[PDB]
Scaffold this motif. Sequence first.
Motif, PDB file in Angstrom:
ATOM      1  N   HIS A  61       9.220  22.610  18.699  1.00  0.00           N
ATOM      2  CA  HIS A  61       9.694  22.436  18.614  1.00  0.00           C
ATOM      3  C   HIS A  61      10.645  21.865  18.682  1.00  0.00           C
ATOM      4  O   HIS A  61      11.984  22.436  19.525  1.00  0.00           O
ATOM      5  CB  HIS A  61      10.268  24.524  18.186  1.00  0.00           C
ATOM      6  CG  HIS A  61      11.044  25.123  17.236  1.00  0.00           C
ATOM      7  ND1 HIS A  61      10.494  25.918  16.884  1.00  0.00           N
ATOM      8  CD2 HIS A  61      11.668  24.294  15.940  1.00  0.00           C
ATOM      9  CE1 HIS A  61      11.785  26.684  15.744  1.00  0.00           C
ATOM     10  NE2 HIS A  61      11.978  25.147  15.182  1.00  0.00           N
ATOM     11  N   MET A  93      10.948  18.482  13.921  1.00  0.00           N
ATOM     12  CA  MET A  93      10.948  19.097  12.994  1.00  0.00           C
ATOM     13  C   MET A  93      11.380  17.788  11.994  1.00  0.00           C
ATOM     14  O   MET A  93      11.965  17.285  12.037  1.00  0.00           O
ATOM     15  CB  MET A  93      11.706  20.354  13.032  1.00  0.00           C
ATOM     16  CG  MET A  93      11.590  21.760  14.044  1.00  0.00           C
ATOM     17  SD  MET A  93      10.485  22.057  13.777  1.00  0.00           S
ATOM     18  CE  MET A  93       8.821  21.083  14.584  1.00  0.00           C
ATOM     19  N   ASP A 153      11.769  24.678   7.967  1.00  0.00           N
ATOM     20  CA  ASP A 153      12.971  24.481   8.989  1.00  0.00           C
ATOM     21  C   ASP A 153      13.745  23.985   8.262  1.00  0.00           C
ATOM     22  O   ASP A 153      14.647  22.777   9.266  1.00  0.00           O
ATOM     23  CB  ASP A 153      12.243  24.054   9.884  1.00  0.00           C
ATOM     24  CG  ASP A 153      13.187  24.107  11.221  1.00  0.00           C
ATOM     25  OD1 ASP A 153      13.984  24.118  11.257  1.00  0.00           O
ATOM     26  OD2 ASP A 153      12.186  24.261  12.551  1.00  0.00           O
ATOM     27  N   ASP A 265      12.842  25.679  19.804  1.00  0.00           N
ATOM     28  CA  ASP A 265      14.231  25.498  19.511  1.00  0.00           C
ATOM     29  C   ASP A 265      15.324  24.769  19.328  1.00  0.00           C
ATOM     30  O   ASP A 265      16.042  25.120  19.090  1.00  0.00           O
ATOM     31  CB  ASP A 265      13.851  26.477  18.925  1.00  0.00           C
ATOM     32  CG  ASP A 265      14.870  26.358  17.575  1.00  0.00           C
ATOM     33  OD1 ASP A 265      15.006  25.222  16.580  1.00  0.00           O
ATOM     34  OD2 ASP A 265      15.361  27.478  16.421  1.00  0.00           O
TER      35      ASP A 265
HETATM   36 ZN   LIG Z   1      14.580  25.101  14.033  1.00  0.00          ZN
END
Ligand SMILES: [Zn+2]
Length: 375
Positions: A61, A93, A153, A265
């Motif tokens: 991520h 992503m 996303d 992330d």
């Molecule tokens: Zn993300």
Amino acid sequence: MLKLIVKNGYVIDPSQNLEGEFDILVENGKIKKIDKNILVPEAEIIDAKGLIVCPGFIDIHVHLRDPGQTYKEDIESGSRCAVAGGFTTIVCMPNTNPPIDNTTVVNYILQKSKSVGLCRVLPTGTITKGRKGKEIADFYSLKEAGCVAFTDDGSPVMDSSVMRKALELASQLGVPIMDHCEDDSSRAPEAEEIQIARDGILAQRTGGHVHIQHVSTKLSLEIIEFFKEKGVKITCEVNPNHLLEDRLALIEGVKRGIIDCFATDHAPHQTFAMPGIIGLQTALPSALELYRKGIISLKKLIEMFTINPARIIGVDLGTLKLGSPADITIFDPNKEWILNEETNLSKSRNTPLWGKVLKGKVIYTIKDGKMVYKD
Ligand SMILES: [Zn+2]
């Protein structure tokens, strides 16, 4: 000099249930032997005394902002962050510009990645053309070009029939759908729980694997747990940097094994994912904090950076099995350091751990038997 020995380290490979003072022999980009006391001619030797030697970390991520917003971050800067944080593989992503919804962009990312030469960047496809929500993308061409998963996303798939079609396709191809990240009725306080439960119900009905990219609540964790017991292919992640209805439940979630993997992330911003933070370079010391507080073992910690993410995107990484590629991370769990202008490898600074004393640092990173990072 085709040959590398990592001597004197403490090896942990959760995939093989392997823990102890062993050496590692690397021949021809690949793990050849694990054994005590290895010595061969014509080999570089790394002294890993006092260090922990494990599989290269995998982050499923990461926002690399490339193509499009390369002033915030790019494939090179993120790659560098990645390897300095112990990561040999990262999954980017598709909320780039242009978005990764056609093979031309897939190819641009793979070619750039090969040229930077540091970590292995695996692209993801969008679920919908444009990430617009209406028209379902060409998962067959995109997986063929090298996409390992699909996600919208930065505008999650509202239409419940779009999600259903996505999971059917995903199940044919053998790849996960990732749902529910926000980045660049209406907003009920329990929108998250309802969404996770929707994704669970469609996952069971389709055979498809769904990966929840954000859980915030105890109820969410219990719902994910309920569907795992029922044999449904649902996974989730948590940002170790974010652990510093409850934040308390997430820790319980990591303890109990509900949460499958760590994932940063990594989300570079140039002002200061709410609106989200960089993560790659601090993931390990953050996660070691849980280990120092007795919440997880070291084996579990390493599990959650290696073999578990590997199994979600279905690549044959996150191990030190004989024959596998020599992606090796070597770290000192007790080395103190500071993220700041001196150490930061991101083009962005957007993290609350800026300036803080961190404990736990990567000393070497090795991809395919080559040293791609050194303290
Ligand atoms: Zn993300």
